[PDB]
Design a protein around this ligand. Structure first.
Ligand SMILES: Cc1cccc(C(=O)O)c1Nc1cc([N+](=O)[O-])ccc1C(=O)O
Ligand SMILES: Cc1cccc(C(=O)O)c1Nc1cc([N+](=O)[O-])ccc1C(=O)O
Ligand SMILES: O=P(O)(O)OC[C@H]1O[C@H](OP(=O)(O)OP(=O)(O)O)[C@H](O)[C@@H]1O
Ligand SMILES: O=P(O)(O)OC[C@H]1O[C@H](OP(=O)(O)OP(=O)(O)O)[C@H](O)[C@@H]1O
Ligand SMILES: [Mg+2]
Ligand SMILES: [Mg+2]
Ligand SMILES: [Mg+2]
Ligand SMILES: [Mg+2]
Lengths: 342, 342
């Protein structure tokens, strides 16, 4: 394989041969690619329209180079709650809040996360502001998961070889196929998740990658553009189960939720967003709670799919709400903060 | 304007707004674009499908930054004979040989040229092997043109600010929109030309750029893939005159030209291709001579267009053949060599 061969194929609008995307990614992640080659590949793959096979190869190479969690430390039914980001709306940290609630309902959560790329405060930034340790390596994430019920895998900590693509992605600015990879490369490799996708036309491709792994995942795109299940309108859900992908539209009104305005979900800096988390876990009613409960329920539905759509959602909403109302979610965050200080 | 705005528009498969392509090219030419940005732009422009407007903007910026020739030193009827290269056939240097013959026939030639990128020996390489000084500056090119009847503008000498782009292009190794720019950026700005294009689907775009300038040009693509008028089969000609383009099919059988095999036009290294030039100029009969006379005639037809198709060709073929047969073409090369030495 070569860069002229692979780039030529992509610029002729042809799907790559098996292994070529993987060759390319490994060149990038071993530091052997020129910035121009990285850029050309990212842009060419994006404009050609990447396939699930190709994206699966890219994610596969990343996982092959990632720091793994130690053996037998991740429950077979662990779940992720994470998105691509890049929706350009700068909301409160819905995945992060949902993840805490889900863990507090008793579902093991091993969350992939990162700092913001465009938003004011990313999930890692807000957790940091809350006193949660976002710097833990493999051993300690495994202990967090065992002792607290949730572990946070800070992406740069687990994916140091991905640094080689970092400057190039920033310099070109524009989203590419690489913006699909975050949720696909959780180093603990949980088999269930509620996965946000900001890019409506590529969500199906992400879903295809999870289907090839036989993951139980809901890939979600709010029809208002959010990489979350939204409360302002319907959401599109690519449901992944038993290796197949089913496309659905989801309306929260079907479960008694009132329509919200997008500005009701607006975020701010790390301190402002940390305060927003504290308010929801404290039992404040309103639009931010509703969106958290909705997304937590989605994660629980994905979890249930590891082993029907309507009762699953009803049970998910019931469990997410109870996890907040009992105080369990607020207590879990406190215990998480205390685990880190120890 | 910004790289994210422009790259975003292109990856959305949208034509650029007026002036955006020029903005981008000026950033590249001033050393202000990162290699990753250069590469992203080249690839995105190529896959979106460039317009004549866009390519014209890129060319315009290069000419703005190029070393010009001194005022009133280029004849108003000067002609170029040059192609994109990149046809992957590795032939003898047909444009270079044609240019010498055309000049010997009395048509002033200010040739844009460069070393090979893929071939074993490009026009510049073969001229160097013949003893011609290829790297002369504006003042001396102008003197060459007046005293010898031909001048050669070495692209890297006249377009020093293009070095950032040229480097990225070698790194990604695949043809892009930038491979159209050579024939479009002759620093002497001749108004006529015989212009080869290796890319059949983009020749019409090149022709459009020349039309906007109201040049008299034949943009040519051999139906065997050559960026030259071929003798192995028919050629497509985008004839540019009166600011309009019309596409023609051209068969040299109509002028008594026998079919050649592409193998008979095969080239080698600079010394072998220099030998091929000497052989043609020395009056050897055969497929190479035929191909040279045909392309020489084409340039003379373009020159005439600055002012009927078939009579123009007949006159061009007669003048080309005679320029060789009288030894005028051999003697002009000898004078060209002496000029550079003295
Ligand atoms: C995967 C990943 C690993 C290491 C660094 C980065 C980084 O870019 O800094 C990274 N990217 C993401 C990580 C997550 N994530 O959830 O951990 C989400 C999105 C992205 C992204 O760049 O689009
Ligand atoms: C324009 C130009 C200017 C400076 C350098 C280069 C280079 O790349 O080295 C260059 N490119 C070409 C120049 C000519 N030319 O006729 O002088 C022909 C083709 C090309 C090309 O790369 O496609
Ligand atoms: O700056 P952006 O590109 O817009 O990304 C915003 C955040 O979304 C992603 O994580 P995640 O879904 O886990 O965070 P969340 O809690 O805010 O939803 C990403 O890792 C960022 O932390
Ligand atoms: O390596 P390549 O990409 O295949 O290009 C072959 C040559 O063709 C172009 O010039 P020109 O038309 O003037 O040269 P010629 O005499 O060989 O036709 C280009 O500048 C190269 O010198
Ligand atoms: Mg999210
Ligand atoms: Mg989000
Ligand atoms: Mg040529
Ligand atoms: Mg050629």
């Amino acid at each position: 394989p070569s860069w002229p061969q692979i780039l030529g194929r992509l610029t002729d609008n042809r799907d790559l041969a098996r292994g070529q995307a993987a060759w390319a990614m490994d060149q990038i992640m071993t530091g052997n690619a020129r910035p121009a080659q990285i850029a050309a590949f990212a842009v060419a793959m994006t404009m050609k329209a990447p396939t699930a096979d190709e994206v699966g190869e890219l994610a596969g190479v990343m996982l092959s180079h990632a720091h793994p969690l130690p053996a037998d430390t991740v429950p077979d039914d662990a779940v992720d709650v994470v998105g691509t980001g890049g929706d350009g709306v700068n909301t409160v940290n819905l995945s992060t809040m949902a993840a805490i609630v889900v863990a507090a309902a008793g579902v093991p959560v091993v969350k992939h996360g990162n700092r913001a790329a465009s938003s004011l405060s990313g999930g890692a930034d807000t957790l940091e502001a809350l006193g949660v340790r976002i710097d833990l390596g493999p051993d300690l994430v495994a202990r967090s998961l065992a002792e607290v019920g949730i572990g946070f895998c800070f992406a740069p900590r687990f994916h140091p070889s991905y640094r080689h693509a970092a400057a190039v992605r920033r310099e070109i600015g524009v989203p590419t196929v690489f913006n699909l990879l975050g949720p696909l490369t959780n180093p603990a490799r949980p088999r269930a998740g509620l996965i946000g996708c900001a890019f409506a036309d590529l969500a199906e491709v992400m879903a295809g990658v999870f289907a090839a792994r036989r993951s139980s995942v809901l890939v979600v795109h709010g029809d208002d553009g959010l990489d979350e299940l939204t409360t302002t309108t319907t959401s599109t859900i690519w449901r992944v189960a038993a290796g197949s992908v089913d496309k659905l539209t989801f309306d929260p009104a079907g479960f008694g939720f009132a329509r919200a305005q997008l500005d009701q979900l607006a975020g701010g800096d790390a301190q402002a967003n940390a305060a927003a988390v504290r308010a929801v876990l404290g039992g404040a009613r309103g639009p931010v709670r509703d969106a958290v409960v909705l997304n937590a329920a989605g994660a629980i539905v994905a979890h249930a799919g590891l082993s029907e759509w309507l009762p699953a959602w009803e049970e998910g909403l019931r469990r997410a709400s109870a996890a907040i109302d009992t105080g369990a979610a607020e207590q879990l965050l406190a215990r998480w903060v205390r685990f880190g200080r120890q």
